[PDB]
Amino acid sequence: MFVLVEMVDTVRIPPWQFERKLNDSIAEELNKKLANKVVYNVGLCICLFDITKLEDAYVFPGDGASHTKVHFRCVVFHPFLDEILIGKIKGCSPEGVHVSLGFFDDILIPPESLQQPAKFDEAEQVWVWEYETEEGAHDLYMDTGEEIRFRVVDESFVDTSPTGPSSKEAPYTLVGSISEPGLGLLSWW
Amino acid sequence: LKPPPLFPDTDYKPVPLKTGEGEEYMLALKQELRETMKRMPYFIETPEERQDIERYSKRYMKVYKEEWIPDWRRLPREMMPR
Amino acid sequence: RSVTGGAWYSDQDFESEFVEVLNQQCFKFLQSKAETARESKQNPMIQRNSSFASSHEVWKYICELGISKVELSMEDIETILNTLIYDGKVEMTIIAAKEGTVGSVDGHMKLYRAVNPIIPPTGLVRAPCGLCPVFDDCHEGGEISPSNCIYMTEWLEF
Amino acid sequence: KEQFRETDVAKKISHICFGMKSPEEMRQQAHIQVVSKNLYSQDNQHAP
Amino acid sequence: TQAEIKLCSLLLQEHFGEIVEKIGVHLIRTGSQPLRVIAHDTGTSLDQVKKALCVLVQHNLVSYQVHKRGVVEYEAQCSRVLRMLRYPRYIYTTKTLYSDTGELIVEELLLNGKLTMSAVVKKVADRLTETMEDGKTMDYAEVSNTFVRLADTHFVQRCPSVPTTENSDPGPPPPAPTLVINEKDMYLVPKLSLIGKGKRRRSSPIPDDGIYWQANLDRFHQHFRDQAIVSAVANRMDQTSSEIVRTMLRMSEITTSSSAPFTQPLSSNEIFRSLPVGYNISKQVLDQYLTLLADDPLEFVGKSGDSGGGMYVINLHKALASLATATLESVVQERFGSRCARIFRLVLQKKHIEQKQVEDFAMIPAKEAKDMLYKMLSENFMSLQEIPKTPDHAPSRTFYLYTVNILSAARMLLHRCYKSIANLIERRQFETKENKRLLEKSQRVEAIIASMQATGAEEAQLQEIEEMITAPERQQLETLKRNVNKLDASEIQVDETIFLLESYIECTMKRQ
Ligand code: SF4
């Protein structure tokens, strides 16, 4: 699921920094600026991988800082479709089961993905399972459970940019699949 | 004070359309025509781009077609598609 | 041109309803006579001669049925007939005052007898855009953006 | 966790391109259509 | 010409696609220029520009010309991009004049743009195989017969050909092959004898090499002009008279030029011998019809001589002036009522008049005409000429004499129609793209239902598939479809107008 992407940016180093060697300061500043945030075309950023090249460090008039342009590589969470994944549950819903990878949580298993036999619960939100001969419609999925196996089947970016003159859902969502044998709770197999 | 609404009403109205078997055939022919423009080389779409991964399915579903060439004696010798 | 206005100026309106209904009556009656001519297709020379609806005879047809009790003799009738001769209800067949009854009086047969609408309506008129009072405006992305022309919206509905 | 956005949009002028405004754009820029000749409300509040 | 440029963009998008639209619009915007600057301006890969130009010249959309300093210039004509709208009409009248084989010939010819006889007849036969079944077959013989008949009757006209290399400019070739057009063989079909039974989609060297062909657009325009004239005549007097005028047009066409104001001389004797045997008409009856037609006060036809007893010549320029005038009356009447057309025509026939005369002579009440003339004047359908009373041309010292400039009038309607078709096209595209989600949702399940039907799968899918939300939306899909159909019918009728409006602005101009 992890992917590596190349980037470029301009970094301002405020003047009391000048003691420490530059490369370290730019690395810190980029991690500060970009870490733990999501880009509209490449997903969720983890941290920078390395810095490839550095231009000259100008000083613009009217300011003490030094501006530098940077070429750098950053590792980003961007799972592609049909990847097999293991992840804890985080909550049931009528429209599906929410799953969590710990650092990320916007995974939904819709009921169409669930196995045919089980369609709804006894009015309790904890999703139940059913099966033909054994498992007489009594297994159910705990809201955390184990790291169930599932395979991604859909994804989307949704924009959240401001609209109109100035003066909560995450911009990324995934859909998983559970139907195929060997998936779900490990105890089943 | 209030300016008029963006659509002021008009007393006259557009005259009823003429219809008939010939006109129906014109309409159907126009539709059929629209369909034809989507199934020959002259319908230049953007060349396919941006594969995600080395999906094993790539072996089978790949679209196969001969390279379109016009007869070259009618055109300048400058724009060969190779 | 005061109280006179042509004696049709009764009610100080040109008596619009009466002038228009009188013109419609003349038109329909001369249609009837030209229709006798057309139904007979009389030896075409005489077909068009009978399609010369004699407007002295029209003048005598319009004094009666109680229509033109008001001033009628030539002048006032001739001029209202002429009000009908200023459009596509008519076309030149007067041949001066000497051929026909005083030129069939201003040519009140001329081509009332027919001149069928040279051509039918026009797609332009039979379409919203062309009929839209507010033209111009309607710009790709704007208030009257053609993507809402209620005229169309309606023409679409109907 | 929210969509990243750049914080500094600062820039520098490089050219002035003079030109003309046609009716469509002139309407598109404007907010309202002034239609009344008068300056203030009849009441003593004198609100425009 | 901006509306027109919008039409070009729309029809390039609809026929060919984005990149082709982009190149075509930029070229029709900038004029004849060499390739390198086009590639620079567009900024795309020269491969795309090259491929698009090859496709465009294949359909004869664009044209390339050798130029000074050895560079090659590429150019397009705006008129040519305004023709595919007429292709339905072309196919209809050809199906009217020829069986479905001629229809297929013409369809293939226009869709390909240029093709030779052998391959077109082969492709027509192949595409006809699915039009007859139960062991029925066909040979290239009948298709060749229809093709040669079409070519003889001038609907089919030969494309240009190269000059011979070993005859002219031996050695390295020039930048462009500089094709030349030959007129004597324009209707001369080459010869073949091959015949082949078409393959019925069972899924299990050229004698006419280089002899390409393309439909004769001018013949179709002339033929349409003839049909319009006949239709005017049929409505004018009678079906018999139009059958007569359809006659004088027949012997006129084979020898008359399309551009002259007047046809070649015709005699009633040759009209009569050409007159159908199925009509019970005598020579004297024809002579009477011709004399009274020539006596028509709209001067549809004139005498112009006495050769052969009956001698008559149709007046093209004057008629089209009448054709156009009438449609001007038409647009006025509906959009402004009969009384308004009553005044407009009055002002036309009275070359110079004033309002008080109009009210007196148009039976219009005061305070009802004045505003209406102002409306016509505001709309520029009426042009004020304004002779003065004094040289300062002060409004207090002038007469408001009205005047009509028919040629200018037509031009704005052309502009109107251009915007009109543009706005229809956009709305249809807008409707298509908004409903595309439900369209594809329906199409996938229709494909699922149509799939594996012959494989013998169980019938427990017709109702099960239908259980979804699409079913109570089919009536909305039908509403969509009729809206599209109904927009298209509107487009169609507008083209029929365009033909007459364009026919006049062409005929009224001398192009000197
Ligand atoms: S407002 Fe709409 S209907 Fe009127 S002219 Fe403009 S596009 Fe056509």
Curated annotation (Swiss-Prot), chain A:
Reported function: DNA-dependent RNA polymerase catalyzes the transcription of DNA into RNA using the four ribonucleoside triphosphates as substrates. Specific peripheric component of RNA polymerase III (Pol III) which synthesizes small non-coding RNAs including 5S rRNA, snRNAs, tRNAs and miRNAs from at least 500 distinct genomic loci. With CRCP/RPC9 forms a mobile stalk that protrudes from Pol III core and functions primarily in transcription initiation. Pol III plays a key role in sensing and limiting infection by intracellular bacteria and DNA viruses.
Gene: POLR3H
Name by which UniProt lists this protein: DNA-directed RNA polymerase III subunit RPC8
CDD domains, sorted: RNAP_III_Rpc25_N
Source organism of this protein record: Homo sapiens
Localization of this protein: Nucleus
Predominant place of localization: nucleus
Record bears the keyword Nucleus: yes
Biological processes per GO annotation: defense response to virus; innate immune response; nucleobase-containing compound metabolic process; transcription by RNA polymerase III; transcription initiation at RNA polymerase III promoter
GO CC term, one of those recorded: centrosome
Family assignment from sequence similarity: Belongs to the eukaryotic RPB7/RPC8 RNA polymerase subunit family.
InterPro entries referenced in this protein's UniProt entry, alphabetically: NA-bd_OB-fold, RNA_pol_III_Rbc25, RNA_pol_Rpb7-like_N_sf, RNAP_E/RPC8, Rpb7-like, Rpb7-like_N
Swiss-Prot/TrEMBL keywords: Antiviral defense, DNA-directed RNA polymerase, Immunity, Innate immunity, Nucleus, Transcription
Pfam family, one: SHS2_Rpb7-N
MF GO annotations: DNA binding; DNA-directed RNA polymerase activity
TM spans (from-to): none
UniProtKB/Swiss-Prot annotation, chain C:
Keywords recorded for this protein, A-Z: Acetylation, Antiviral defense, DNA-binding, DNA-directed RNA polymerase, Immunity, Innate immunity, Isopeptide bond, Nucleus, Transcription, Ubl conjugation
Binding locations of [4Fe-4S] cluster: 129, 132, 138, 149
Gene Ontology biological process terms from the UniProt entry: defense response to virus; innate immune response; positive regulation of innate immune response; positive regulation of interferon-beta production; regulation of transcription by RNA polymerase III; transcription by RNA polymerase III
One GO CC term on file: RNA polymerase III complex
KW Transcription (keyword) present: yes
GO molecular function: 4 iron, 4 sulfur cluster binding; DNA-directed RNA polymerase activity; double-stranded DNA binding
Keyword presence, Signal: no
Compartment(s) of residence: Nucleus
Family (UniProt): Belongs to the eukaryotic RPC34/RPC39 RNA polymerase subunit family.
Pathological condition linked to this protein in its record: Immunodeficiency 101, varicella zoster virus-specific: An autosomal dominant immunologic disorder characterized by reactivation of varicella zoster virus (VZV) infection in adulthood after primary childhood infection with VZV. The viral reactivation manifests as central nervous system vasculitis with stroke-like episodes and lacunar infarcts on brain imaging. Features include headache, hemiparesis, impaired balance, and other neurologic signs.
Free-text note on domains in this protein's UniProt record: The [4FE-4S] cluster-binding domain adopts a globular structure that serves as an interaction hub that connects the POLR3C/RPC3-POLR3F/RPC6-POLR3G/RPC7 heterotrimer to the Pol III core.
UniProtKB/Swiss-Prot annotation, chain D:
Known tissue expression: Expressed in the brain, in the cortex and the white matter (at protein level).
Self-association state and partner proteins as the record states: Component of the RNA polymerase III (Pol III) (Pol III) complex consisting of 17 subunits: a ten-subunit catalytic core composed of POLR3A/RPC1, POLR3B/RPC2, POLR1C/RPAC1, POLR1D/RPAC2, POLR3K/RPC10, POLR2E/RPABC1, POLR2F/RPABC2, POLR2H/RPABC3, POLR2K/RPABC4 and POLR2L/RPABC5; a mobile stalk composed of two subunits POLR3H/RPC8 and CRCP/RPC9, protruding from the core and functioning primarily in transcription initiation; and additional subunits homologous to general transcription factors of the RNA polymerase II machinery, POLR3C/RPC3-POLR3F/RPC6-POLR3G/RPC7 heterotrimer required for transcription initiation and POLR3D/RPC4-POLR3E/RPC5 heterodimer involved in both transcription initiation and termination.
Protein name from the UniProt record: DNA-directed RNA polymerase III subunit RPC1
Family listed: Belongs to the RNA polymerase beta' chain family.
Residues of the full protein shown: 3 to 50 of 1390
Location(s), subcellular: Nucleus; Cytoplasm, Cytosol
Swiss-Prot record, chain E:
GO biological process: defense response to virus; DNA-templated transcription; innate immune response; positive regulation of innate immune response; positive regulation of interferon-beta production; regulation of transcription by RNA polymerase III
Region (Disordered): 160-180
Keywords, ordered alphabetically: Antiviral defense, DNA-binding, DNA-directed RNA polymerase, Immunity, Innate immunity, Nucleus, Phosphoprotein, Transcription
One Pfam family matching this protein: RPC3_helical
Leftover remarks: Antibodies against POLR3C have been found in the sera of patients with systemic sclerosis (SSc).
Subunit-structure text: Component of the RNA polymerase III complex consisting of 17 subunits: a ten-subunit horseshoe-shaped catalytic core composed of POLR3A/RPC1, POLR3B/RPC2, POLR1C/RPAC1, POLR1D/RPAC2, POLR3K/RPC10, POLR2E/RPABC1, POLR2F/RPABC2, POLR2H/RPABC3, POLR2K/RPABC4 and POLR2L/RPABC5; a mobile stalk composed of two subunits POLR3H/RPC8 and CRCP/RPC9, protruding from the core and functioning primarily in transcription initiation; and additional subunits homologous to general transcription factors of the RNA polymerase II machinery, POLR3C/RPC3-POLR3F/RPC6-POLR3G/RPC7 heterotrimer required for transcription initiation and POLR3D/RPC4-POLR3E/RPC5 heterodimer involved in both transcription initiation and termination.
Protein name: DNA-directed RNA polymerase III subunit RPC3
Organism: Homo sapiens (Human)
UniProt gene name: POLR3C
